[PDB]
Write a protein that binds this ligand. Structure first.
Ligand code: HEC
Ligand code: HEC
Ligand code: HEC
Ligand code: NO2
Ligand code: NO2
Ligand code: NO2
Ligand code: CU
Ligand code: CU
Ligand code: CU
Lengths: 454, 454, 454
């Protein structure tokens, strides 16, 4: 067989598993070992977006699940525990396992129980693992996937950084960024119409203050998974190229590509060399996933600019929109305050400030000045102040035709923004009214609900 | 040109075509031949699922169509007959043909007619063929696709087994597993929202008693097609790895991969070596296709267990659901009896028994015992017996909150199962009521229709 | 770094950009140069289909945008101008640029403004460029994409022809071929449900009299882009094979394939050798895109037939439908005449003639004769003449069961054609009534609207 390195030697090894986006250290081993892996399923609510909760089903308390790292030819004794708070039974199918269901029949585990099976890791590569419990799509859609690396016997080449990034498609009953606890939506899932497409189980999980880091001249390896359940990723790095892309345990290695299709249930190892500083965006280049459903992650490179290679500026809110900033925690806070019935004007102002970036600032500017004759001002706007209810209609339904704002004629088009939720429109307009010498006061989510219903 | 092996020699050869999942024997030939291929289009109703009929349009009476096997450099005299029972005209486009439409203009054939064209097979590889008659998508959606292998002059390497598997997406007016003759649905097809995603033209075409077979240590080659019309397959083998994957006639060969994207209209040759016994599942890893729309096939390996490679059990209904069993013929029978107006309690019981596997048994167990305090019993259930109409609402709409069943409190969540058809809910509940000392009687499809409509 | 060819030498070069489907000449240069690229964004209405207008956002006035051709190691001084008629701000992200956003932050340009940034072209390959202005999906959906080729230092191998083809998915508020100015539809775009899938920004942009041309024995290189925003192309040539397919700047080259997946935001260079004359169709083999949404382009090869390679005929309306003919300009004219209120019978007749090809002619024949006993005649049809309102219902809703036409019984099935627009049904039936000794008169779009609404 392949991985014919003999029986296990040395001492039994208790695998150290890591949470995303971190990876266990290289096994750094010249002999096949008995590796004991202990993984516990936990069902729990987490924020899938600011002020949006979702009941995830997790291997090890994270989406994606704990990263497992073994050596080709190792004997793996796999212990799956199902936490007693669980409502569902669970199991595991690991890609790269030689045997029926990749462990599924022998790993079936009720709440409060433990299962074990043993396999030999014959196949070198990066592999998805996931729950295989009927209904399998519901389990995978709730977050039950991760990666197992089976190293070659000599190990992978040394790099400066190793990271763990996994795409998933998610199906909420509510629309994108609709606040509250969102149930799983079986109808959207069967139709392959996801509300969110995420890296590492949340909007902003790898943006702003949670970006991946490296320095100019350093090499970065990323273990990239696609848990699906349904989507194929047009996986892409903006402003850079992959030195290498290798799928699962394939003999084939692609070099010098920027865009690479990762199948549902697929995994790849990509290598990046940092050349110039700034934010490098990992996206699904099925572009409405990246810019409208959350499928964007950041590798931030620090070091000296090289103007002979690139004269341009760091990314800002024009491209990254409301994910240019370190975090959008003011949205989380304003959502919690609405639930408590303690929402203040300042709660709304700070939430609207976060949401205004890109969404509005691309045309009206970060300071609301616009561009005279081209984009009208929101700063000290006579037109805004004259009719706050008109302002709600303009955000939801757009505006075209001749208007006069602060003594100047405009004859342009503001597209409708009907996909913004009532709370988002209310908070954005409350921010504008309380900025730039505007008259103050507030717009409520309920005010916007009524304008939306006409 | 490529395939420059001279004029045909020897005697004219009448091609022996095979029905899926079988393949003609290797051509075993050192000279270029005139090969006469005779293929007849037949329009006919077949079961796309138990109790679900569909009017397929077929090359040779099967979906996929008859397998054609020739040698690179052969001259192929292609005869397409359209059976006189046909209502539509048909033609053929073969991938790997050098010339406009791959045969389409010269193979146009009305009902009761025959067409012929001649081509030289210049291009070695595995290739899709399909109907190219306006409207082309409707013809391909109805089943008009298959494979032609153009062997290299030296032939392919010897293997123990060669099989023929082809994915297709199907568009029925009714929902998945809705019984009766289902028309083609042009609106779903244009939207790329299929009701079924199948291997070899039916649910269960390659599961249970229709699984592919091999023995431990044997090599298996599978000629894998994607007829589409629309979907890209994340083609995957659960619990194994492909030794090799080669697309069409490509120079590139990928080795040691488990998951491989097959384009719409694409074909690949995959090679598998059997290492340990059990069921190896071929799926589209766009997971709701595999587990919710029918996209699963089985390679069953017999031979000795190797506990040093895999200690675990054969797949069961937890993973494979209602396709773990040899067949679901009791569903076909109960559907026919409903049509005839002769449906008995025992017809419903045997149909419900088949449908209970996975769907219900994953939590309630195959014997209905559940798990005390975790999953309540259906065996001798006081809660079930107290209100059969509540039971219908529980299956359709789910159940949460504190209940008491047979003296024990449960405080868990049963997800809704609204995608089950009225007949499926009726037959499942009739099985439960007539099992495990439950009070008997029956639930009708009409009973469930009324509860569904609230 | 890669592309380490030293500082720029010689004179500054003003890049000559080409409109699709043409490509600039090879750079034919042995030294690294300063290349000045001047690209202007223009927002303008164009015909996305006959009688269907759409407001495109373009780089250089075309979809795809102007083709840029430089050499690896060149220093590119990139000037982006936004025409003063523009309503939106715009920027550019070029794939293959080393730096944050691929130029996005430094190229942000309001209407009437100009931006510039400088980059070194370190990475050889074919690369997509596109707008990266919030909301990014809306900009790319409106047509803001093209290709930049970064040649290897030795240049690409010489070929007889180089062409420029780029797929895009488009989202109109109206249905496919619904006439008038069609707005962008954000809901369809977020759902990845396009109304059109096009090569080079229009139905028929590369069919009939706008086909690409070559001769038997000539080599053709096509630079193939997928601008998306959302779809992955199962990119395929009917009746031929690609000698080579190379993605972006990848080291991997696939040879001898017919079907190849191009990611959203991806690009490939394909090479074709012309062997026999006729029309070679480039399609997205997600077949309803190619045959129902416009995703078809033609390479027309002229030269001598080789009956030993292919005995068959050139493609006709059976396969290519209404795109077999040189153009469908009669539809454009009849749509303009409806708008003006000057639509004549002859305007409708010429439009219906164009639309009848394939749509109706596949069964009823180009001369309306049908096939006695199999497909009834439209020529001198007693059944058509007896009830013109029934004819409208037959096109919209189909026809089955026994009928008698011109003394012969038919017992067949005409599928419904409900996706045809009111104007298309009206014009097709007016063509039939005014042909083949039929009684004349006309059907109006309003007549069909009323029958459709029942
Ligand atoms: C893509 C450009 C663009 C974006 C994005 C945009 N606007 Fe506008 N907005 C305009 C233009 C142009 C006008 C003037 C329209 C006209 O000439 O009829 C306008 C007008 C307005 C007006 C009324 C005139 C004024 O200056 O007081 C308000 C209020 C406004 N926008 C608010 C917003 C808010 C809040 C956002 C984000 C939620 C937003 N806009 C996003 C372009 C934009
Ligand atoms: C994923 C788990 C799961 C699946 C699948 C499932 N159930 Fe349940 N079922 C439960 C749980 C948990 C409860 C108790 C809910 C509570 O605590 O409120 C339940 C309660 C019930 C009850 C009422 C209580 C009792 O024991 O009599 C019935 C009847 C029932 N299920 C039938 C079915 C049938 C029939 C199927 C399949 C069609 C099914 N269930 C599938 C978990 C499941
Ligand atoms: C795929 C085959 C097919 C296509 C495409 C088709 N038809 Fe028919 N058509 C038929 C058949 C078969 C019948 C007779 C149906 C029956 O036996 O009940 C028919 C009947 C008719 C009739 C009534 C009988 C007669 O001969 O006068 C009309 C009118 C007609 N078609 C018009 C059209 C028009 C206009 C188009 C295109 C818009 C069209 N058909 C496309 C197959 C087709
Ligand atoms: O680089 N494109 O998103
Ligand atoms: O192995 N996954 O379905
Ligand atoms: O060759 N198929 O469209
Ligand atoms: Cu699970
Ligand atoms: Cu056909
Ligand atoms: Cu733009």
């Amino acid at each position: 067989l392949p991985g014919d390195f003999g029986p296990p030697r040395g001492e039994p090894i208790h695998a150290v598993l890591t949470s995303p986006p971190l990876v266990p250290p290289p096994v750094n081993r010249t002999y096949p070992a008995k590796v004991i892996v202990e993984l516990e399923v936990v069902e729990k609510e987490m924020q899938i977006s600011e002020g949006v909760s979702y009941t995830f089903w997790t291997f090890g308390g994270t989406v994606p699940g704990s990263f497992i790292r073994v050596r080709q030819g190792d004997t793996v004794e796999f212990h799956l525990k199902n936490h007693p708070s669980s409502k569902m039974p669970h199991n595991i199918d690991l890609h790269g396992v030689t045997g029926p269901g990749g462990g599924a029949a022998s790993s079936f585990t009720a709440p409060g129980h433990e299962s074990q099976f043993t396999f030999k890791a014959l196949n070198e590569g990066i592999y998805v693992y996931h729950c295989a419990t009927a209904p399998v799509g519901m389990h995978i859609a709730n977050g039950m996937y991760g990666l197992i690396l089976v190293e070659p016997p000599e190990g992978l080449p040394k790099v400066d950084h190793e990271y763990y990034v996994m795409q998933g498609d998610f199906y909420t009953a509510g629309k994108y960024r609709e606040k509250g606890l969102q149930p799983f939506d079986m109808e959207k899932a069967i139709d392959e119409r996801p509300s969110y497409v995420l890296f590492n189980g949340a909007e902003g999980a790898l943006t702003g203050d949670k970006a991946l880091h490296a320095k100019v001249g350093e090499t970065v390896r990323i273990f990239v998974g696609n848990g699906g359940p349904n989507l194929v990723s047009s996986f892409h790095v903006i402003g850079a190229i992959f030195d290498q892309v290798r799928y699962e345990g394939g003999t084939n290695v692609q070099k010098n590509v920027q865009t690479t299709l990762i199948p549902a249930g697929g995994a790849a190892v990509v290598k990046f060399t940092a050349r110039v500083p700034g934010s490098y965006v990992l996206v699904d280049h099925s572009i409405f996933r990246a810019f409208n459903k959350g499928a964007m992650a950041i590798l931030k490179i620090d070091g000296a600019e090289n103007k002979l290679v690139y004269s341009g500026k760091e990314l800002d809110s024009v491209a990254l929109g409301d994910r240019a900033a370190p975090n959008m925690s003011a949205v989380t806070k304003a959502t919690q305050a609405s639930v408590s019935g303690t929402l203040t004007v300042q709660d709304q102002v700070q939430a609207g400030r976060a949401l205004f970036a890109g969404t509005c600032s691309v045309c009206h500017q970060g300071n609301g000045a616009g561009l005279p004759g081209v984009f009208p001002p929101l700063a000290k706007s006579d037109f805004l102040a004259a009719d706050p209810k008109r302002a709600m209609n303009i955000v939801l339904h757009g505006l075209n035709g001749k208007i006069k704002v602060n003594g100047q004629e405009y004859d342009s088009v503001m597209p409708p923004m009907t996909q913004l939720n009532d709370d988002e429109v209310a908070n954005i307009l409350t921010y504008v009214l309380n900025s730039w010498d505007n008259p103050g006061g507030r717009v409520s989510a309920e005010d916007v609900k009524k304008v939306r219903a006409q």
